[model samples]
Target: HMPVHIVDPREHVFVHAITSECVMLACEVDREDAPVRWYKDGQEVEESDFVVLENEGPHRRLVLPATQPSDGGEFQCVAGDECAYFTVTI
Candidate 1:
């Protein structure tokens, strides 16, 4: 059986928003302890300027302080080998 899978953000879905709005990308996995990582434009995302990481139970969260032109792009959340993708358009 698969050890983990992403259950949120709705796979390649596009999320539209305006600038200065709070943007949150979340991923829920099958395993509570499974490692979760986030990517933007295929590069790893890190915490800075409230670009924070939070995990609760089986859910992993990537929080951005506010929306901006540079923030709009492809986002991916991964747990084990399963991934969930979504796009941000601002």
Candidate 2:
């Protein structure tokens, strides 16, 4: 397929719901073994509390559970050597 690319600067807002069970961040990648990373506010995820998954054919998922308002911030996913960035709000 055409060299994989994903949309960036994703903006999201969450309200009403007092609690969020999960947040999904998606990315597109061309090659297998492409690594995906998650960032919140301005910090890199360093705990097993978050789950990240990658797919060779297309999309990758960054799964976050029990999200709060502060969980919102700039998010990024890196594949191969390319990077995609997005913003989230709650």
Candidate 3:
């Protein structure tokens, strides 16, 4: 496994969504080859019809299609020591 590294430290964010809507969350690490981790309510998030997790180079993205109430939670994106949080409310 590749080691994680922090590129930037930013403030937390909040996102509001509605059912049947689309949402996208983007994350980036310091190293272009480092892996990005995303957690939802303290658990690792997985990709599905309602969720899409993509890692392109140093950037990571979470896309949601037709959002639902169950999708609302505390989201955390981490890369090394750098991390950020986002609260999603539906």
- Number of backbone-clashing residue pairs for each candidate, in the order shown: 1, 0, 0
Cα-based lDDT at residue 19, candidate 3: 93
Candidates 2 and 3, the one with greater TM-score: 3
**Over the stretch 1-90, how does candidate 1's per-residue lDDT look in tens digits?**
557766565546778878879888777877777867888888878878667888788878888877788889988776757888878889
Best by TM-score: 1
Question: What is candidate 2's lDDT per residue for 1-90, written digit by digit as tens?
Answer: 544344442434332322455666676555544545655554765556454443445566666666666666677665545667766656
Give residue 8's lDDT in candidate 1 (0 to 100). Answer: 62
Clashing pairs in 1: 12-85
Q: Candidate 3: list runs displaced more than 4 Å.
A: 1-9
| Deviation of model 1 at 51, angstroms | 1.2
**Ten consecutive residues with minimal summed lDDT in candidate 3?**
1-10
lDDT of each: 0.78, 0.56, 0.78
- Using Cα atoms with residue i matched to residue i, what is each candidate's TM-score against the true structure? 0.84, 0.57, 0.83
Model 1: residues >4 Å from true position, as ranges?
none
lDDT tens digits, residue span 1-90, model 3 = 657765533666788899978878887787787666889887889877667897788778888877789889988887755677888899
